[PDB]
Amino acid sequence: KELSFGARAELPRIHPVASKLLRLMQKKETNLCLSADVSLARELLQLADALGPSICMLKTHVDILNDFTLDVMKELITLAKCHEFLIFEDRKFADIGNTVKKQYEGGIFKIASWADLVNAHVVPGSGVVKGLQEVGLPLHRGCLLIAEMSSTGSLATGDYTRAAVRMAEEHSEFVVGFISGSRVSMKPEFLHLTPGVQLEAGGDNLGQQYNSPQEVIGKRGSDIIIVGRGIISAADRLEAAEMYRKAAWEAYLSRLG
Amino acid sequence: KELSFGARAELPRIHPVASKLLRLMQKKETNLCLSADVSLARELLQLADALGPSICMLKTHVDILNDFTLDVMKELITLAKCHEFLIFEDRKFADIGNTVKKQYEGGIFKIASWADLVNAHVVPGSGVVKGLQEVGLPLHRGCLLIAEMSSTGSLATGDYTRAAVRMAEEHSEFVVGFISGSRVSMKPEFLHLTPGVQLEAGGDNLGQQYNSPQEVIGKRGSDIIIVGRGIISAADRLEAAEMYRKAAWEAYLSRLG
Ligand SMILES: Nc1cc(=O)[nH]c(=O)n1[C@@H]1O[C@H](COP(=O)(O)O)[C@@H](O)[C@H]1O
Ligand SMILES: Nc1cc(=O)[nH]c(=O)n1[C@@H]1O[C@H](COP(=O)(O)O)[C@@H](O)[C@H]1O
């Protein structure tokens, strides 16, 4: 029988980052991750502040920010602490271990310095995780492995997905879960986060495909919905975030039944 | 029958960026791409200028430069034009089409403004290419698809590699070739670039595996070697670049008969 988020926060094998997340999800009654796909720091921070109470997590693509600075990320950390949500940089590390270690720690973005969570493609083999984990371990960071993708023609299926799950199990001191379309692991210490989510049926013009929060949380067994345009494109982003939060939260409650 | 780089430069279906590359390869007798894996702009520029005459291409990870600015890029372009080599940003785009479009055109790096070539993982499905091409085609750029990887445990094998080749075939207005360990396409319009290259047998401590220039160019039929540490860690980077250039060039000549 399915454990609540609060109970999963207490699992013996739980990573500290996953535990903090699960605790705030339970506290705030939200399993919504905002995909803050904007190009302006001011818009990012205004959404983070207004929607902070409604979300468990804010997912960034800082490489799309036109006016990125480390001071912007400092302000984002302040809002994340104030409102209690994790920061997830959707960087999709996908290179050899020696390279991703530098991409995570260094350069202009210094992603490890501010992101609670990052993600990696499993295509390079487990060196991708080993390289990241050397940086993320003393910083008490976590990583999500990309086990499935939402887009048309995704090759992250079958044995590929299985390889991601095995890699996660073998690196559970750093890997806290998955980007996937459905539950892919039966181990409850792993988080499942699912993008390609909208209330309405459809897709976009570049291969994105959508499923509803009820389908993804309720039937497919995932934990958190990641929602970009379904919220960002609304006139009132707060009302939209609330619609998504209630959808995902009630689907989760249903599944506990 | 195998064609020279100079003849391949003239093929009817050749992409203009591949043609430019192939002509300078022939002209300079170099099929060496320097992997300029450094953390400082000064070093990137110093190596680009010193090794420029020995290389057909300089591969960047701009996200590992502690002091990236667009002015550094502007200088790098000046060197590329002076010495005649292409700039290849090894960004490994690997997200949905709508996202990579932004990551290629925008943010702080403005990658499409300066990179002749970029690369993409094929795992998201062909939307990754469609998104990139919306930015890359107007800017007269090319893309390489990652068909194989050099690292231990790579999942880019078998049907995954075949999928990469099909996707390239089908997007030949923008995709000019592959990152691969061997020749994966029989079509001579496509370039094959191979990383994981050193003169000696070995690897690194995070899953890199090395093969020699003779093995990669001569036996495995690839076109260009990509070499980082084999050159940059050497005491004499000029001599090292020349050894790799001579090795790759004579392996090509031999294969050619
Ligand atoms: N990380 C992802 C993995 C994935 O499979 N699909 C996906 O859309 N994403 C990201 O989620 C967000 C989906 O946004 P939207 O389609 O809801 O606007 C975008 O930032 C994508 O880059
Ligand atoms: N793009 C790559 C694809 C790949 O399969 N292997 C690889 O090493 N790379 C890159 O090539 C370079 C290899 O450098 P070195 O091992 O020669 O130092 C690094 O920048 C890697 O990120």
UniProtKB/Swiss-Prot annotation, chains A, B:
UniProt-listed GO biological process terms: 'de novo' pyrimidine nucleobase biosynthetic process; 'de novo' UMP biosynthetic process; pyrimidine nucleobase biosynthetic process; UDP biosynthetic process; UMP biosynthetic process
GO CC list: cytoplasm; cytosol; nucleus
Span list, region OMPdecase: 1-257
GO molecular function: identical protein binding; orotate phosphoribosyltransferase activity; orotidine-5'-phosphate decarboxylase activity
Residues noted as binding orotidine 5'-phosphate in the record, renumbered to the chain: S35, K59, K92, D95, T99, S150, Q208, Q209, Y210, G228, R229
Keyword annotations of the record: Acetylation, Decarboxylase, Disease variant, Glycosyltransferase, Lyase, Multifunctional enzyme, Phosphoprotein, Pyrimidine biosynthesis, Transferase
Record field: catalytic activity: orotidine 5'-phosphate + diphosphate = orotate + 5-phospho-alpha-D-ribose 1-diphosphate; orotidine 5'-phosphate + H(+) = UMP + CO2
EC number(s) given by UniProt: 2.4.2.10, 4.1.1.23
Coiled coil ranges: none
Binding site for UMP: S35, D37, K59, T60, H61, D95, T99, S150, Q208, Q209, Y210, G228, R229
Pathway: Pyrimidine metabolism; UMP biosynthesis via de novo pathway; UMP from orotate: step 1/2; Pyrimidine metabolism; UMP biosynthesis via de novo pathway; UMP from orotate: step 2/2
Positions of the catalytic residues: D90, K92, D95
Family the UniProt entry places it in: In the N-terminal section; belongs to the purine/pyrimidine phosphoribosyltransferase family. In the C-terminal section; belongs to the OMP decarboxylase family.
Related illness: Orotic aciduria 1: A disorder of pyrimidine metabolism resulting in megaloblastic anemia and orotic acid crystalluria that is frequently associated with some degree of physical and intellectual disability. A minority of cases have additional features, particularly congenital malformations and immune deficiencies.
Function of the protein: Bifunctional enzyme catalyzing the last two steps of de novo pyrimidine biosynthesis, orotate phosphoribosyltransferase (OPRT), which converts orotate to orotidine-5'-monophosphate (OMP), and orotidine-5'-monophosphate decarboxylase (ODC), the terminal enzymatic reaction that decarboxylates OMP to uridine monophosphate (UMP).
Assembly, per entry: Homodimer; dimerization is required for enzymatic activity.
Record-given protein name: Uridine 5'-monophosphate synthase
Organism for this UniProt entry: Homo sapiens (Human)
Gene it is expressed from: UMPS
